[PDB]
Design a protein around this ligand. Sequence first.
Ligand SMILES: Cc1cc2c(cc1C)N(C[C@H](O)[C@H](O)[C@H](O)COP(=O)(O)OP(=O)(O)OC[C@H]1O[C@@H](n3cnc4c(N)ncnc43)[C@H](O)[C@@H]1O)c1[nH]c(=O)[nH]c(=O)c1N2C=O
Lengths: 9, 666, 133
Amino acid sequence: PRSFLVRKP
Amino acid sequence: PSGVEGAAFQSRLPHDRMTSQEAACFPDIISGPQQTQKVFLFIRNRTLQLWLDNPKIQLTFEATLQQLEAPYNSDTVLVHRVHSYLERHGLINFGIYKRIKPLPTKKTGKVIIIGSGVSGLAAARQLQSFGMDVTLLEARDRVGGRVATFRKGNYVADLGAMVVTGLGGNPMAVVSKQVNMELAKIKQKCPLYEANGQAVPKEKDEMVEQEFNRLLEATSYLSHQLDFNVLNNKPVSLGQALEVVIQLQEKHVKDEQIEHWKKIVKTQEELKELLNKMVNLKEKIKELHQQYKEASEVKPPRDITAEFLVKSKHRDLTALCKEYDELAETQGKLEEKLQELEANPPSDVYLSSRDRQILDWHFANLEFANATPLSTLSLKHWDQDDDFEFTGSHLTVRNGYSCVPVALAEGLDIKLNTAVRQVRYTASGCEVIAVNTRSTSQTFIYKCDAVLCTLPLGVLKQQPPAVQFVPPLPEWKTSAVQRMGFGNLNKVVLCFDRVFWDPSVNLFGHVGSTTASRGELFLFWNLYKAPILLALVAGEAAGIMENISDDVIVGRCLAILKGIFGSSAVPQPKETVVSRWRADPWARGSYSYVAAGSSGNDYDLMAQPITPGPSIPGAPQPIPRLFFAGEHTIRNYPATVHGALLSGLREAGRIADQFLGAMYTL
Amino acid sequence: RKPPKGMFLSQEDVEAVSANATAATTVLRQLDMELVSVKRQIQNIKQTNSALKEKLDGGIEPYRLPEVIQKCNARWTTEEQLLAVQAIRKYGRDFQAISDVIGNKSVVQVKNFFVNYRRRFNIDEVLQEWEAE
Ligand SMILES: Cc1cc2c(cc1C)N(C[C@H](O)[C@H](O)[C@H](O)COP(=O)(O)OP(=O)(O)OC[C@H]1O[C@@H](n3cnc4c(N)ncnc43)[C@H](O)[C@@H]1O)c1[nH]c(=O)[nH]c(=O)c1N2C=O
């Protein structure tokens, strides 16, 4: 999923 | 969102419109007058709110009709239909609640559930809630499957799912009220720390990150507006498209240096011509002046043809001197322009070995998020599930995520250490063949009306098969299984006696040395009460670090940590755990990803249940008997606990509708 | 509708870089080689202009002549009548020059002077002998 991305902008 | 409309949002439903699922159960209202729809919609919206404000006691029909006002509490079958629909499809009275109306003495129907992953537990708990006989088969000796949780003394750390991705419309919000879960919030700040051992400075840190997000958007622009989605008959991956974007950005940097210098030579070559006219006038001038001193040497008195000669030469020379002056005029502008043109030279490089490596850490980030090399993700579809992201902060579970499966498991018939080896489904029913994991010789047979399969996609993918289907799964299902992607990302847990990291930063990167190792220990998490640091192994590195002893892996971790905090602040770790999800035979990977050549539609194929052929030929088409749940079955929420849980809720409702009948469609 | 700003992604470039495996690197090398070639040309021409620049050292200060501050006049002494005919022989109709040569008459003075003495000084024949060269 793209939602796990850390430090999301 | 707040009020009844907030309940709709907190339940992933539009408040002002009826879903495709409701149109199924209330076709009488969707095609009817808009007035009744808004009634219905309000009738649904209030009901969720009542469950939502108090999700530790069952919401009974009566309790719901009590607390409605007129005109809404006038049609009692509407209220009964709505409340029944909701309860059935797990929107209310799911999870762990005190039951008001106790269980029916005798159950109806028998269902075998393969796996007590969260999807499994969730369905089992719902089916039992519906008065069905439900048995879960479990290859492991513990519940929760990919919700794994280390414990030793006060040390606690998840090797599996670790973050709740926001409570805004998350079913795990409900669970969190229903079970003592200490949810600690994650602080977004994350300092990168390259291979030397020192922070990347904000100026750089911010600009790579800015380029990174810019790079992602570009790819989005390649697939959607330029249709760059096939290339040599093969589907374009996100990884390829990132390279094709960088290349077109590296080409642009050169293309603009060329343009710059080309302007410079256009002027320098036009200045050259100018000097030629000036070094040719200075000798028409040299010779005219000579001719004038000679004509002026003839002392007077002189006849007019000789006086005219001096005046003529004097005029002619002045003309040329004006002319040459107007050209050191122009010889001046161009000289100024040249320092301007050079003075403003455009960038020499797009990115450099420094830049290009911090950029590789933002790619290790993506790889960890999708648990796979960016070369395997689908360019078009890798982010398809992003419309449904939750709102609110991202959270951790200070007491370990395990406490949730364990909580769900109470009251349930769970056979642990039972590995299913074969599933046989026929028109009259099914029988599952399992063994004892400890002593493989002992064999078990379970006969049932229907099998709910929550086997991991990695398990399902296994060749040769770890579970035989009799009859074989149809081609349309098995091609969805190939086509799909089941990735991998392991973790390394570091238990110390003392805190030596910044205790107010939760997470900090390590910038790798190579593109190839961009994922190898590229991120550490400080999440827990106890002194535990947790290290991620993502991307291509995850698969390979599994062929390496823990000791060696911990060495690399210690070396990376020492560089950050000094070779003497970093003690020896008291307890160390590194797992192996790709090697775990009850997982065979970590979670799913939209592989190149797949789509989210494949996630829908995975959820279609299987209906076998008729026993006696000419018999009427039977009931479906094999159902599928789990993380790789819920298109909108794949690889993300709620999604598992949500898919288990889904199958339970659709199995009940099948074997118990729907008394809410009339 | 468009990329992010600064990203350069036209359809043509993408094919050009996807045409084979190494097409992207091959295209980048040609620009790389091309930039080096233009750079060497720039230095080459710098040298040349630097040589042509030294031949012009000192400008024309030695070859310049002081300005003649002189008032105008409309009387034609026989002398500057004669300067005139000769200048008309030498400069065709460029009155600024013929003004410059005479020194004490303006273009109008020269300009009017043509018609007045055209019969007497045979300016007609003088003119067509200017043409010949
Ligand atoms: C390392 C890691 C980190 C995270 C996440 C995932 C991972 C891997 N995931 C994904 C979730 O695990 C997934 O949603 C769910 O666990 C699937 O969970 P699920 O799909 O519902 O089931 P399961 O695979 O957990 O359980 C399958 C069960 O089936 C059993 N089984 C298998 N073969 C069998 C057989 N033959 N016979 C009998 N039983 C068999 C197996 O042992 C287990 O008991 C996260 N999810 C989330 O929300 N936040 C997170 O932080 C994370 N996390 C990190 O980011």
